[model samples]
Target chain A: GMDKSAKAPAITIFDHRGCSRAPKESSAKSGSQDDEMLVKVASTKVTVSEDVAAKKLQEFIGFKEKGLDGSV
Target chain B: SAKAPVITIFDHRGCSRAPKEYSKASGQDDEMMVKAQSVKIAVSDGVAESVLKDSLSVMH
Candidate 1:
């Protein structure tokens, strides 16, 4: 089905963090410091978002609708 | 407190002539994978989950 009209779509899972206005707290201790805490948290959240998006994408793919007009 | 990140999946080929069917179709699972392309937009899960609990909530 390689019709000239064939459109091979790509599924892009995007990560959208909260508003940039969110406050970023830096814990700078006396001697040593580590970015691991916040960094790990950020990473986990992104993964969660990705998973959710993936499910949605799957739903869109399974629908009987012929195509999505980019809405929703 | 922090919030989790928001994730969104988009179709890259919707604009083109490619079929507008979902990636998973009857006996056409392979076709779905072949036609779709994936792209990574960003990374910020922890914040989204923590700060905005309701933001990352998915129905399905």
Candidate 2:
């Protein structure tokens, strides 16, 4: 039983709102929590890092088009 | 103007295998072409933060 050739698939997270928030403490210091929200990914409930969350939020909010479309 | 709702996309390793034709026709990467494994839409109608988090936590 030495079959070790399986490669792991890459996982990518997209924040449509682009309004993800940072950790409570970090966000409090930045004074940006008023306009931010929290998000979680995966079934295991892995909380995404503050940096990624914040970045995605920015992108989602600034996206050119916002709606329930099949494409992003 | 009223605030618009937000949309989030999480790719769970299925879209990456989308056919080339899908990407070509859509003018997007295979990742965007393939169907999203999960989607969460949050309305800006004064919904509680906890409610949004709870809704997003479960993906089927």
Candidate 3:
């Protein structure tokens, strides 16, 4: 029987909010150009590009089968 | 309208080793305590739930 307790991996979940063109170009409100994404790990506080973050996420998930948004 | 946040679980299956993101002079551990490291993967609770259970069961 194993008697050792390994550490629990610490993870953080974050969100990217989505907003529509309060009408698109030259609109009253700023429009969003990215899809809203929920992330785990690669725990960042501020906003970042999807390529980098998604790459880290997929890599950590051991996902190397397909490319996402032109990711390797 | 706001969309609900999607939940994702990254299982390493012992094939991967993750680096620490919370460690330093700050209260990194504090946030770890308040925030959850456990959750059900949306539309596939079985995927996340079962994976975690087997891993924890294997550990002491």
What's model 3's TM-score?
0.18
DockQ computed for model 2 against the true two-chain complex using alpha carbons? 0.05
The residue-by-residue lDDT of candidate 3 on B1-60, one tens digit each, is 333443434332333344354333354333221212343323344345545745533432
lDDT of 3 at A2: 35
The candidate scoring highest on DockQ is 3
Candidate 2: residue A69 lDDT (0-100): 72
Worst 10 residues of 2 chain B by lDDT: B33-42
Candidate 2 lDDT over residue span A1-72, tens digit each: 734644333232323334443334223343553334434333322334555565467556433446687775
Model 2: lDDT equals 0.40
lDDT by residue for model 2 over B1-60, one digit each (tens)? 444444444332344354443314334333442222233333432235445554554422
Arranged by DockQ, best first: 3, 2, 1
Where is model 3 more than 4 Å wrong at Cα? A1-72, B19-60
Name model 1 segments beyond 4 Å from true: A1-55, A64-72, B1-33, B44-60
Model 1: DockQ vs. true structure:
0.04
- Candidate 3 residue A2 C-alpha distance from true site, Å: 58
